[PDB]
């Protein structure tokens, strides 16, 4: 028993709780953090674990695939399309709450309409986007409109653009037949893939921008988080939020555990050790702004 049984056992049980104090005043050494991050299994799936034909055309990277047990299935309630496929996964949030996020790649030109179908079906009201200015056509596409565009059966229109210093908030609507819904769009640039943000301040503010985003609905939908591959930056963002939530509720955080649980939801979440180190730096900062 069995690369897979031993991977799952690890991800399901590994933990390393850290108090507000230990985080601030005695974190694990950069050495320990590296050695620790390497021990975490990736939980990638092989192309052999997904029997979907033609999914390859819908993936930005051949090796970054949604785990089947949490994959988002497009039920096609609003269109005629062949598959149910989109490279995306439900992600559990604080304390295991189901479907708090959906982690996905940024759409490619041929998956723009699948994305919006996901946004609709899942009743997404908040999209968080992580990118860099250098990022070209092949890593990222402008899948929202200038004023107004039809994407498949939807009308997306831009109701407002406001430029905060570290991100752009766009208020959109998406409308299908008679039903028109609000979606808040946060684009956070200056975050290159395989790297970290310039510093933690801007990330914590992005996280707050999301916290203080009014929760209109009765069965609130998942927050969509995306980047080119949908795991590195998307992982850091989502790990930072969950981590802040644990610190706030419990005065401690388990980062190792958090990362492990994200990899159960979608393989590869958090790509580099340096990103894992940054998570500790950011969360250490966050502790200091907590009451008292």
Fold and architecture overview:
The active site is at 227 (phosphocysteine intermediate). This is Tyrosine-protein phosphatase non-receptor type 7. Belongs to the protein-tyrosine phosphatase family. Non-receptor class subfamily. It catalyses: O-phospho-L-tyrosyl-[protein] + H2O = L-tyrosyl-[protein] + phosphate. Residues 33-286 form the Tyrosine-protein phosphatase domain. This protein is α/β, with parallel strands linked by helices. The chain has one domain (1-292): Alpha-Beta Complex (Protein-Tyrosine Phosphatase, Chain A), CATH 3.90.190.10. The protein is 32% helix and 20% strand. It has eight helices and ten strands. An eight-stranded mixed sheet has the order 2-3-9-4-8-7-6-5, sandwiched between helices. A two-stranded antiparallel sheet has the order 1-10. Strand 5 (148-151) and strand 6 form a beta hairpin. The longest helix has 18 residues, at 233-250. It is globular and about 55 Å long. It starts with a helix and ends with a helix.
């Amino acid at each position: 028993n069995t690369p897979r049984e031993v991977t799952l056992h690890f991800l399901r049980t590994a933990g390393h709780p850290l108090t507000r104090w230990a985080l601030q005043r005695q974190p694990p050494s950069p050495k320990q953090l590296e050695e620790e991050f390497l021990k975490i299994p990736s939980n990638f799936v092989s192309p052999e674990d997904l029997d979907i034909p033609g999914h390859a055309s819908k993936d930005r990277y051949k090796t970054i695939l949604p785990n089947p047990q949490s994959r988002v299935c497009l039920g096609r309630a609003q269109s005629q399309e062949d598959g149910d496929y989109i490279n995306a996964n439900y992600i559990r949030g604080y304390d295991g709450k189901e479907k708090v996020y959906i982690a996905t790649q940024g759409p490619m030109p041929n998956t723009v309409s699948d994305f919006w179908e996901m946004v609709w079906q899942e009743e997404v009201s908040l999209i968080v986007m992580l990118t860099q200015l250098r990022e070209g056509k092949e890593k990222c596409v402008h899948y929202w409109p200038t004023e107004e565009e039809t994407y498949g059966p939807f009308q997306i229109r831009i109701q407002d653009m406001k430029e905060c210093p570290e991100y752009t908030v766009r208020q959109l609507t998406i409308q299908y037949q008679e039903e028109r819904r609000s979606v808040k769009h946060i684009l956070f640039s200056a975050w290159p893939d395989h790297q970290t943000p310039e510093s933690a301040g801007p990330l914590l503010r992005l996280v707050a921008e999301v916290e203080e985003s009014p929760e209109t609905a009765a069965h609130p939908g998942p927050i969509v988080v995306h980047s080119s591959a949908g795991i590195g930056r998307t992982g850091c963002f989502i790990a930072t939020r969950i981590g802040c939530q644990q610190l706030k509720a419990r005065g401690e955080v388990d980062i190792l555990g958090i990362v492990c649980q994200l990899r159960l939801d979608r393989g590869g979440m958090i790509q580099t050790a340096e990103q894992y180190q940054f998570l500790h730096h950011t969360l250490a900062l966050y502790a200091g702004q907590l009451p008292e």
